[PDB]
Design a protein around this ligand. Structure first.
Ligand code: COD
Ligand code: MG
Length: 163
C-alpha cells in the first residue's frame, strides 16, 4: 500500500480533448499521474517542448495530482528514474493495439518491473488523432471540438507567424 505513480508518455503535439479525458480518468484512480512529454530531438514536431508542456499545464493544471515533465531517452529508464508503478496508454483504433503489445512486452524484457495499463476514452474522443488535428488546423479548419481552447489559439498564433 505504497503511493502509486503512473507515467503517461506522449509527444502531445498538441494535447487533445482525448488526452485530457484520459489524464482526468487516470488521476481519479492513481495517486500521482505524470504527463511525460517526449522531447523527440530526431522526431521533429510542430510545437516546441515549451509550447507542448504549456498547453498541457493549461488544460490539466487544475488537477492537483498531475505533474508535467519533458523526457528523452529510453522510456524504461524514465520509468525507473521516476519510481513509477506503471505506464498509462490509451486504446481506441486497432493497429495501436499490436504495437502497444510489442512495447509492453519489449520493455518488460528490459525491466521486469515495467508495467503498462490501458484506459479507454469517452466514445466521443475515439476518432481524434493528433495527426488528423494538425492536418485540419494546417488547412484553416475548425479544430475547436477536438482540442482545448489554448490549443485553438496556439494554432492561430502559429498561422499568424506563417503557416
Ligand atoms: C511518445 C510515445 C509515448 C508514443 O505516443 P505518441 O508519439 O503516439 O503521441 P500521443 O501524444 O498521440 O500519445 C498519447 C497516448 O494516449 C493514446 N492516445 C493518443 N491520442 C488519443 C485520443 N485522442 N484519445 C484517447 N487516447 C489517445 C495513445 O495510445 C498513446 O498511448 C513514444 O514516443 C514513447 O516514448 N513511448 C516509448 C517508446 C519506446 O519504448 N521506444 C523504444 C525506447 S523509448
Ligand atoms: Mg494521438
Amino acid at each position: 500500500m505504497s503511493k502509486t505513480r503512473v507515467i503517461y508518455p506522449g509527444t502531445f503535439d498538441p494535447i487533445t480533448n482525448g488526452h485530457v479525458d484520459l489524464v482526468t480518468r487516470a488521476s481519479r484512480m492513481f495517486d500521482e499521474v505524470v504527463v511525460a512529454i517526449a522531447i523527440g530531438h530526431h522526431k521533429n514536431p510542430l510545437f516546441s517542448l515549451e509550447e507542448r508542456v504549456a498547453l498541457a499545464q493549461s488544460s490539466l493544471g487544475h488537477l492537483s495530482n498531475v505533474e508535467f515533465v519533458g523526457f528523452d531517452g529510453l522510456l524504461v529508464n524514465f520509468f525507473k528514474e521516476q519510481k513509477a508503478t506503471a505506464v498509462l496508454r490509451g486504446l481506441r483504433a486497432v493497429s495501436d493495439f499490436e504495437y502497444e503489445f510489442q512495447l509492453a512486452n519489449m520493455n518488460r524484457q528490459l525491466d521486469p518491473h515495467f508495467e503498462a495499463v490501458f484506459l479507454t476514452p469517452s466514445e466521443q474522443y475515439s476518432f481524434i488523432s493528433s495527426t488528423l488535428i494538425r492536418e485540419i488546423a494546417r488547412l484553416k479548419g475548425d479544430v475547436t471540438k477536438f482540442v482545448p481552447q489554448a490549443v485553438v489559439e496556439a494554432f492561430e498564433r502559429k498561422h499568424q507567424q506563417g503557416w
